[PDB]
DNA sequence: GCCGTGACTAAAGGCAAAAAAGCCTTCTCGCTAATG
RNA sequence: UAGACGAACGGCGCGUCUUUAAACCAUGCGUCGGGAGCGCGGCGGGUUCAGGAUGAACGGCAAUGCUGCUCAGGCUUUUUUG
DNA sequence: CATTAGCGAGAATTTTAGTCACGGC
């Protein structure tokens, strides 16, 4: 631990029963700053109708989470990431729940291919932010690997 | 949507009625897919669709479907949610006995047919016959044969018997059974034979008959023909990660039966031998029994997981089970967790909360108000904004909290102030900040524990939580009237730092106008804190008809007591602040306040004196420092001269003079007294100092050191740390209990070498232990406490009875551990309050007695007082308001609603952490004497001697109260008499302890009559004595030829004749005794009533077994019919004895062991309900002779000793309740007009309220006898099957009241817990009245 | 669970957990080392004649 | 601003009638008009009936006079 | 830098704490001269001395330095290092006592008492008794406040009893223990208590209803039924005991 | 023989959390895959 | 490349074939979608009877279709905390 | 280029009370 400055002394009740007070000068020289390393896991398996494919094409995302991306969906070294944001962009297909000419007509004019996709990415736990720091990936024997791989 | 709860048993069309289909196939999933298999174990067509409104199949969709069996898939098309409700049913090829009837305790079968279990069990598994039609043979109806047996037999009789192997062979043999005859033979055999034997098993069968006759079953019905099968959902099959599947081991005893019925009806079309098929039907049988429960039969069936599969009657019991993880306390909604922190801005009624968790939680009320102001328009804009975290976000949300009550929740709890609500505050950070006043009433400190948090939502929910949660209306504890407000730690020191006053300070000396400019004084610096200075002051007394009166005068203070003056409120007079201001007077002194100027002015006192402690504390400095532990000079010298007595001590063992233990005992003296000396040494020089007062002089105050201050103000620890600091540790205590001969001569201030430190572990370890353990016994100690209290609660206004108990105040031979102030306070007498003078009334009947009438109480000096007791109310299904008193919540009295019995195992559970797991008499004071149901004679020599039982002692004062009591036992000696005033500190009676005298009565002349030497009596004059005289020799010598014979010394006088004892002529011989020395001779003189010869010879599982009520291992036997005392036939194994009434006859007798002691002999006259042997007692006997009153005082002054023993003050009408609650059962004594067995077992209330209305017609009433049972029995005993179930033992309670068909009517508080009504209490018992009224 | 007094220099009576598992997750000693056979021994001075 | 409720109590018979009766009266408050007779200060609607208990001129009986009286039209 | 508290001193018996305290306040003291001879930039002579008057304080202490041995360049290095405090190594039950440590400090310029004046920063005055100020080793737990944060107002729920989840991981609720229970149960709160157990636990009908009822505005709870109690029906029903309800 | 005693069996034994991991029967076969 | 089939229709996916509906599997491959009620009739499957492995009738439900009207993740195991 | 594996799918301690069994007079 720490080498530290102490008084035996109640302090307008701040150290009521057993509580510690702390001056800001403690957090000013980061005397007790502590590091922690959390590991997140993303899984790709074969699940039915079709495989499961991680990139950067995910829908229902904006400009800012996917500026943190590479065009294989994995966020690059170093990028400050916060929490609720997203980190590997995973996808899983589906049919394509039939036809409807107003809704067809609109997505014809938004340019969408085929709208057959879940999104199922990992994203960051909530409150708690950093910075990535490295990104293994294991891939099985008989698989194409991407750019990033 | 409900009145009623009926359970009773099942039969196969009524399952056929619940089922849908049957399951033939034991496949669950395709695999291939993850659709259902077809007529598997998630079967669509039996139970229901997968995905809602569309078939299997897929063929019938559209809204235009629902309602349609689609062909082709054969599936019922509808929503989901019927996979809850559909069950399926199997029909097995060969009848099954169930399991639970078949192997409880009580085998409901085997009492049925009359049968020993073990046989029934052999029948069952295929290894034994049995006869199931004897026919005109030499065979009986339930005879039984084996193998061989039945091959020899089957010649000998051919067709004309049947014998057969199985659940089909019990199940003709129930079918076959009548009932009508078989009650008609019970009911005439009953009154037949006399034998208590055979009367339980007797009434037990007539019973169960009589519930089979009277109820709508059939004996069959408990062997299974038709399984039910639990629906699909309930046992999911949930996909785990990858193509593996999570499979309930239920699923696998389902395919496990399904398998053996499958193969059981394939082989029972080959016509396979006996052989094959009886293995296959036992294997079925086994599979089906730990189907219903694993492990009960033999071994239970385990996977590849080598652990025991659920079972069904398994996932109901148990803390895994059912009830006690999913219906009493389940996972809630809209809660938190978080680090409690103390703050000291806050106000009481306030406790902080993290911004974050305060956002997240409110995250529903947000929602409507940010679309009623318009910035938002849809739900899934309104989640967009909130977690973008806008300005506007901030302004609403704190504009839903601004009195939006919140629950603080700590786990455990143990008390009512568990849980409590506050008006959040919204503040920056991570952690709930909370008042400090209130975390001694959670019993919580800030060393990391961590809060919860709930949140109400309906309008009735925050109404009722600001009305009776928040810490303002709970300033008393449910326990007992003291504050629970305690002021402790910081603010206790720094007010007692403010209150002390010292001879010589800077400003010592001047007067001041008023508290106004004092302030000023101190912040200046031109004077100190504490100087005894003249100062005028205003004091506002309310003792008018409630108006305050003002009035000014000129006190000798310190400067500081004027500096709390500003903020006391009016009411107080100023001598509450002129000493020192202790922890126990200012907690007190809060007290005062709640009994003067209501309760408003009292918090905001509590909050201004937490204000001011807190500041002058901090501008105090009070500090601890290694100077400040003063190590006594002498003790060091003490301790070397200590060791010379011991270090002469063992010369005299060595010596040969003393043994072991008595040098153990002197060394134990030595090392105790040797540390009381220390002791006392270093507190005397430790309190005191001295300085030079302003007059050059040295004065010894009081010693200012810190150490000083936190030991005398009360604020942390107890003297015994300060000793151990100081001075040396003393005795300690080895791991088996016994004492280390050499203790520890240093202390913590000074080093403690390795031997020493180590023994000291001993100790710590042993507690921490303690610390570990006691926990277990005590919680669940509290749950016996609840099951058995929770049916209770106050229904009505007044009984308008005038019973009660006498209450008086205890006394223990010494100091009266609890006056009678205490003890009636707040209660309601059952009779009038007449004056020592009589005909004079101090206080009515039915007036409850506060404070002021406790002051007329002590100034008129009343003995005693009966009070009402709600043992004995005579309201029904409750207690009525009167007869409970006041209540310690709100101080006055007693609301209709609130259930008693919860807070008062509260109380009585709390405080068992705090508990530990593992001649002469001399007047003490000043008095007179005075003796009750004494019956004392005058002996020659003019002393007093006793010839009663309960002589007791009393030290009546100048007016009459009680001072102390004894007991004193036969032939005692008194150097004074009865009201004579007496001086305190003498010798007013002594006897011979060690042995029993066999003293005379009157004086005369001895003549041994009937003297046998030679086997009875011999002259054993022992040559160590060398003392001729007679010795009445033992039993080992004599035999029944000389043992019988009584040698009596008939008492005569100097005629010789019998002594003519007033009122019986009867001569008062006594029976010489074996071992009974005749140290006397004929011819000399014998003093009046002289001895004849000397005849010799706890904790909290201490509570808890009296609770309940353990019969001890030696029961006291005592008198139970008055009447003279009279001997029986003895030497049939022990010792016999017949009590005979004056007038009515005597059919009493009883066994005693005759190698027992004894207390009565033939020419005695005994009381019924009087001692016998000594030792401890049975409550169930105390009951049956002394009755109701007597037994609630035992209990009660056995565990408030215990309590006071340990140190915590538990008010007495709390276990009293559990009392009520623990008489709740009767036995009927003759059934009379009343329509009951005679030895039926029947509720006293309900007894009670039949009897009343059948004697209030043309009838008699029935004679009844209220019994005893434990809380472990009584709990089980009663008519709430499901509350028993929820509690323990729920295979027994299901069977029995399935069987006895039992109906539940959701009259007490736990069955409305359960299926989410109302509770019958609190706000409540409105709605529920408004309902039966309409019934 | 108790603490016997055989414990010295092989047991630690002051250091284990506390909670439901106390005294049963003993730790060792500084200078206790395993016999041959799998007994605890600790190292001792020899005295001769003072 | 309320920290205590003991004269409201006293006002009425006990507590919980109190609070039955004042969960009425906000219930009838808050689902549609029925504004309060007394000035209010920036107060959620628990609260505000909780005022006109003290002053005394509401009670469970009272309420079911206004009632009678509103349905009577 | 740290208040601790002293009420903790006497119960807790932790009476050591108070001589490391004193201990360690000799110790940085130590160091502040030779930090001040640094500053000034003193000649190595100066320090040989002073370090060898500290190191031959004691009686009888085992530990031996010759500093005559270390060069100029070493001795300057082990003071340059020395700066932030001289370390004090303490046998487990060879201690040196107060004296020795009063001795030690006598050698710094504080008062032997260990018991310093202090002016508070909110109100400039001299506090009314000596207080004792030192230097302590601290540690900081692997308990976070973050990793014990947890709240949930509407997450997922349970398939078997539609309960919510338990579990920080899961957004899990909050367990309303049987002791809870009957401690509201002890108070008149019903209303609480029912809606408690039957709105918020796994009413379907009742938590889709309130939860739309309080984003209207309205606070109304309906009774409903706990699918817990059902489920209990059916495994009632489950085995050969019949239970059913009533009429309404 | 009938009340009394010993031996056998059943039931229950703090409450909340967090954090990690491991994992949800065993014997047999043809086309595809692994090995030489 | 295109076209056709795969428990009623259609779209897409997957498998087979090449102008044929077959082949595949077997609660007849997968996903999704049909504004609702009343009227017609029956896809589809069921019952009865007869005939001697086949045929006839039937309507409780109902496919594609048609005229008219009304409606908007459990358990287990550890470790730690209070 | 031939051989066998294999693999996914298919199936065969402590406390106390209550109750049954022996016994002895
Ligand atoms: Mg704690
Ligand atoms: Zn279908
Ligand atoms: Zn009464």
């Not at chain 2, 949507?1 to 395709?30: C, H, Q, Y």
């Not at chain 2, 030991?711 to 000793?723: L, N």
């Not at chain 4, 009936?49 to 509103?70: K, Y």
């Not at chain 5, 009888?60 to 340059?80: I, Y």
Request: aromatic share 6%.
């Amino acid at each position: 631990g720490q080498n530290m400055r102490v008084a035996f002394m109640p302090w307008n009740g701040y150290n009521f029963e057993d509580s510690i007070l702390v001056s800001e000068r403690v957090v000013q020289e980061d005397r007790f700053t502590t590091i922690h390393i959390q590991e997140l896991a993303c899984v790709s398996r074969d699940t039915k109708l079709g495989p499961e494919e991680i990139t950067a094409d995910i829908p229902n995302v904006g400009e800012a989470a996917l500026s943190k991306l590479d065009e294989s969906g994995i966020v690059y070294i170093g990028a400050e990431v916060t929490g609720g944001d997203i980190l590997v962009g995973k996808v899983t297909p589906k049919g394509e729940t039939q036809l409807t000419p107003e809704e067809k007509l609109l997505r014809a004019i938004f340019g969408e291919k085929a709208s057959d996709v879940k999104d199922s990415s990992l994203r960051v736990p909530n409150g708690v932010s950093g910075t990535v720091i490295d990104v293994q990936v294991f891939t099985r024997d008989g698989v194409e690997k991407d750019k990033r791989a | 949507e409900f009145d009623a709860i009926k359970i009773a048993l099942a039969s196969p069309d009524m399952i056929r009625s619940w089922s849908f289909g049957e399951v033939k196939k034991p496949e669950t999933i395709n695999y291939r897919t993850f659709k259902p298999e077809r007529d598997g174990l998630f079967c669509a067509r039996i139970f229901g669709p997968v995905k809602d409104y569309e078939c299997l199949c897929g063929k019938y969709k559209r809204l235009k479907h629902r309602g349609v069996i689609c062909e082709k898939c054969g599936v019922e098309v509808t929503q989901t949610k019927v996979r809850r409700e559909r069950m399926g049913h199997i029909e097995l090829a060969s009848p099954t006995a169930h399991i639970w009837f078949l192997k409880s305790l009580p085998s409901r079968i085997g009492l049925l047919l009359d049968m020993p279990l073990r046989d029934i069990e052999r029948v069952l598994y295929f290894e034994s016959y049995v006869v199931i039609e004897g026919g005109m043979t030499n065979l009986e109806r339930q005879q039984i044969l084996t193998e061989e047996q039945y091959l020899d037999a089957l010649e000998e009789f051919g067709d004309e018997f049947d014998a057969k192997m199985g659940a089909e062979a019990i199940q003709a043999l129930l079918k076959s059974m009548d009932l009508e005859q078989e009650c008609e033979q019970l009911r005439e055999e009953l009154n037949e034979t006399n034998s208590e034997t055979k009367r339980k098993k007797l009434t037990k069968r007539i019973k169960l008959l009589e519930a089979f006759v009277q109820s709508g079953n059939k004996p069959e019905w408990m062997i299974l023909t038709v399984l039910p099968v639990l629906p699909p959902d309930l046992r999911p099959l949930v996909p785990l990660d990858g193509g593996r599947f999570a499979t309930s081991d239920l699923n696998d005893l389902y395919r496990r039966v399904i398998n053996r019925n499958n193969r059981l009806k394939r082989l029972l079309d080959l016509a396979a031998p006996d052989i094959i098929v009886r293995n296959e039907k036992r294997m079925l049988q086994e599979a089906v029994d730990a189907l219903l429960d694993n492990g009960r039969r033999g071994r239970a069936i385990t996977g590849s997981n080598k652990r025991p599969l659920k079972s069904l009657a398994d996932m109901i019991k148990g803390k895994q089970g059912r009830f006690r993880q999913n219906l009493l306390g389940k996972r809630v909604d809209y809660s938190g967790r978080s680090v409690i922190t103390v703050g000291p801005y806050l106000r009481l009624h306030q406790c902080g909360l993290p911004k974050k968790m305060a956002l997240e939680l409110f995250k529903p009320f947000i929602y409507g108000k940010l679309e009623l102001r318009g910035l938002a328009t849809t739900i899934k804009a309104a989640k967009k904004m909130v977690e973008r975290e806008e300005a506007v976000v901030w302004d609403i949300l704190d504009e839903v909290i601004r009195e939006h009550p919140v629950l603080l929740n700590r786990a455990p709890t143990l008390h009512r102030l568990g849980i409590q609500a506050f008006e959040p505050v919204l503040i920056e950070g991570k952690a709930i900040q909370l008042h400090p006043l209130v975390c001694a009433a959670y019993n919580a400190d800030f060393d990391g524990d961590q809060m919860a948090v709930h949140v109400p939502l309906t309008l009735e929910a925050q109404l009722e939580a600001r009305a009776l949660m928040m810490s303002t209306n709970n300033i008393l504890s449910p326990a007992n009237g003291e504050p629970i407000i305690v002021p402790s730690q910081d603010v206790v020191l720094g007010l007692y730092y403010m209150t002390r006053d010292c001879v010589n300070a800077k400003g010592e000396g001047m007067v001041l106008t008023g508290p106004k400019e004092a302030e000023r004084l101190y912040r200046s610096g031109l004077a100190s804190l504490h100087a005894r200075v003249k100062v005028r002051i205003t004091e506002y007394e309310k003792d008018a008809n409630g108006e305050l009166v003002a009035k000014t005068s000129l006190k000798d203070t310190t400067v500081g007591r004027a500096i709390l003056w500003m903020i006391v409120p009016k009411g107080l007079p100023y001598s509450i602040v002129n000493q020192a201001l202790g922890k126990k007077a200012i907690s007190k002194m809060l007290n005062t306040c709640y009994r003067i100027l209501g309760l408003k002015p009292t918090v905001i006192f509590a909050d201004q004196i937490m204000y001011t402690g807190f500041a002058y504390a901090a501008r105090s400095g009070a500090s601890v420092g290694i100077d400040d532990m003063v190590i006594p000079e002498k003790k060091h010298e003490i301790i070397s001269e200590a060791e010379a007595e011991v270090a002469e001590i063992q010369e005299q063992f060595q010596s040969g003079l003393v043994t072991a233990g008595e040098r153990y005992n002197k060394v134990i003296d030595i090392w105790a007294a040797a540390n009381d000396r220390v002791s006392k040494a270093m507190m005397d020089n430790l309190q005191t100092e001295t300085v030079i007062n302003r007059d050059g002089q040295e004065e010894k105050q009081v010693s200012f050191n810190s150490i000083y201050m936190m030991a005398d103000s009360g604020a942390r620890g107890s003297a015994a740390q300060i000793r151990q600091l100081a001075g040396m540790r003393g005795l300690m205590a080895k791991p088996d209990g016994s004492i280390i001969e050499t203790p520890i001569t240093a202390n913590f201030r000074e080093g403690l070498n390795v031997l020493q430190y180590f023994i000291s572990t001993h100790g710590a370890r042993k507690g921490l232990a303690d610390t570990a353990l006691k926990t277990a016994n005590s919680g669940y100690l509290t749950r016996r406490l609840v099951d058995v209290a929770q049916d209770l609660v106050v229904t009505e206004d007044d009984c308008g009875t005038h019973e009660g108990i006498m209450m008086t105040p205890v006394i223990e031979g010494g100091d009266v551990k609890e006056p009678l102030r205490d003890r009636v306070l707040g209660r309601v007498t059952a009779e009038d309050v007449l004056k020592p003078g009589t005909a004079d009334i101090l206080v009515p009947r039915n007036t409850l007695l506060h404070e002021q009438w406790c002051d007329l109480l002590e100034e008129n000096s009343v003995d005693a007082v009966k009070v009402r007791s709600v043992v004995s109310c005579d309201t029904d299904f409750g207690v009525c308001a009167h007869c409970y008193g006041r209540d310690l919540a709100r101080g006055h009295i007693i609301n209709k609603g609130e259930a008693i019995g919860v807070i008062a195992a509260q109380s009585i559970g709390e405080p068992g952490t705090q508990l530990t797991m593992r001649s002469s008499i001399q007047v003490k004071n000043k008095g007179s004497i005075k003796l009750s149901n004494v019956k004392s004679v005058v002996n020659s020599s003019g002393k007093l001697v006793i010839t009663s039982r309960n002589t007791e002692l009393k030290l009546i004062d100048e007016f009459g109260r009680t001072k102390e009591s004894y007991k004193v036992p036969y032939g005692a000696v008194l150097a004074k008499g009865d009201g004579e005033q007496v001086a305190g500190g003498e010798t007013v009676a002594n006897w011979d302890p060690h042995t029993m005298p066999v003293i005379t009565e009157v004086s005369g002349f001895v003549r041994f009559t009937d003297m046998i030497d030679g086997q009875t009596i011999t002259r054993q004059t022992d040559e160590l004595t060398g003392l001729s005289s007679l010795v009445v020799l033992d039993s080992a010598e004599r035999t029944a030829g000389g043992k019988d014979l009584r040698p009596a010394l008939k008492i005569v006088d100097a005629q010789g004749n019998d002594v003519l004892i007033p009122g019986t002529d009867m001569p008062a011989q006594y029976f010489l005794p074996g071992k009974a020395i005749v140290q006397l001779e004929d011819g000399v003189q014998i003093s009046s009533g002289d001895t004849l010869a000397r005849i010799p010879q706890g904790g909290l599982p201490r509570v808890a077994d009296l609770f309940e009520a353990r019969r001890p291992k030696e029961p006291a036997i005592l008198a139970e019919i008055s009447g003279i005392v009279s001997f029986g036939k003895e030497t049939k194994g022990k010792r016999r004895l017949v009590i005979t009434p004056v007038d009515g006859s005597d059919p009493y007798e009883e066994m005693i062991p005759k190698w027992r002691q004894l207390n009565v002999f033939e020419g005695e006259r005994v009381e019924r309900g009087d001692v016998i042997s000594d030792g401890p007692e049975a409550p169930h006997d105390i009951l049956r002779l002394r009755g109701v009153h007597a037994v609630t005082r035992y209990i009660v002054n056995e565990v408030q000793d215990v309590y006071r023993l340990q140190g915590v003050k538990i008010n007495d009408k709390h276990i009293e309740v559990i009392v009520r609650q623990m008489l709740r059962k009767a036995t009927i004594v003759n059934a009379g007009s009343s329509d009951f067995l005679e030895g039926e077992q029947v509720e006293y209330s309900r007894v009670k309220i039949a009897n009343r209305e059948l004697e209030a017609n043309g009838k008699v009433g029935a004679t009844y006898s209220r019994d005893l049972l434990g809380i472990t029995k009584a709990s089980l005993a009663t008519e709430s099957f499901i509350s028993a179930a929820s509690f323990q033992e729920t295979t027994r309670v299901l069977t029995e009241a399935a069987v006895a068909g039992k109906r539940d009517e959701l009259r007490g508080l736990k069955e409305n817990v359960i299926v989410g009504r109302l509770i019958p209490a609190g706000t409540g018992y409105a709605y529920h009245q408004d309902r039966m009224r309409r019934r | 669970r108790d603490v016997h007094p055989t414990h010295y220099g092989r047991v630690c009576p002051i250091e284990t957990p506390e909670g439901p598992n106390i005294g049963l997750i003993n730790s060792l000693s500084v200078y206790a080392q395993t016999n041959e056979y799998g007994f605890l021994e600790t190292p001792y001075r020899k005295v001769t004649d003072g | 601003a309320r920290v205590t409720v003991q004269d409201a109590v006293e006002k009425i018979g006990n507590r919980f009638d109190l609070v039955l009766v004042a969960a009425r009266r906000a219930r009838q408050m808050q689902v549609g008009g029925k504004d309060p007779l007394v000035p209010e200060e920036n107060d959620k609607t628990t609260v505000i009936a909780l005022r006109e208990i003290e002053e005394g001129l509401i009670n469970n009986q009272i309420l079911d006079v206004r009632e009678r009286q509103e349905q009577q039209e | 830098d740290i208040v601790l508290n002293p009420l903790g001193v006497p119960s807790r018996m932790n009476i050591g704490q108070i001589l490391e305290t004193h201990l360690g306040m000799a110790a940085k003291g130590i160091g502040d001269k030779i930090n001040a001879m640094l500053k000034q930039q003193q000649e190595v002579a100066k320090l040989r001395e002073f370090i060898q008057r500290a190191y031959d304080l004691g009686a009888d202490v085992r530990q031996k330095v010759d500093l005559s041995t270390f060069s100029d360049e070493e001795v300057m290095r082990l003071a340059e290092n020395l700066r932030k405090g001289m370390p004090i190594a303490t046998p487990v039950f060879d201690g040196a006592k107060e004296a020795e440590i009063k001795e030690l400090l006598k050698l710094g310029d504080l008062p032997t008492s260990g018991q310093i004046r202090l002016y508070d920063g909110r109100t400039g005055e001299q506090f009314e008794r000596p207080v004792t100020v030192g230097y302590m080793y601290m540690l900081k737990l692997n308990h976070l406040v973050d990793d014990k944060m947890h709240a949930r107002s509407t997450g997922s729920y349970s398939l078997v009893t539609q309960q919510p989840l338990g579990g920080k991981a899961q957004f899990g609720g909050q367990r309303f223990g049987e002791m809870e229970v009957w401690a509201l149960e002890a108070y008149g709160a019903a209303y609480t208590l029912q809606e408690m157990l039957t709105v918020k636990s796994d009413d379907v009908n009742g938590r889709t209803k309130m939860y739309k009822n309080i984003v209207d505005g309205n606070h109304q709870m309906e009774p409903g039924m706990p699918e817990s109690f059902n489920v209990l029906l059916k495994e009632i029903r489950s085995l050969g005991i019949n239970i059913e309800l009533e009429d309404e």
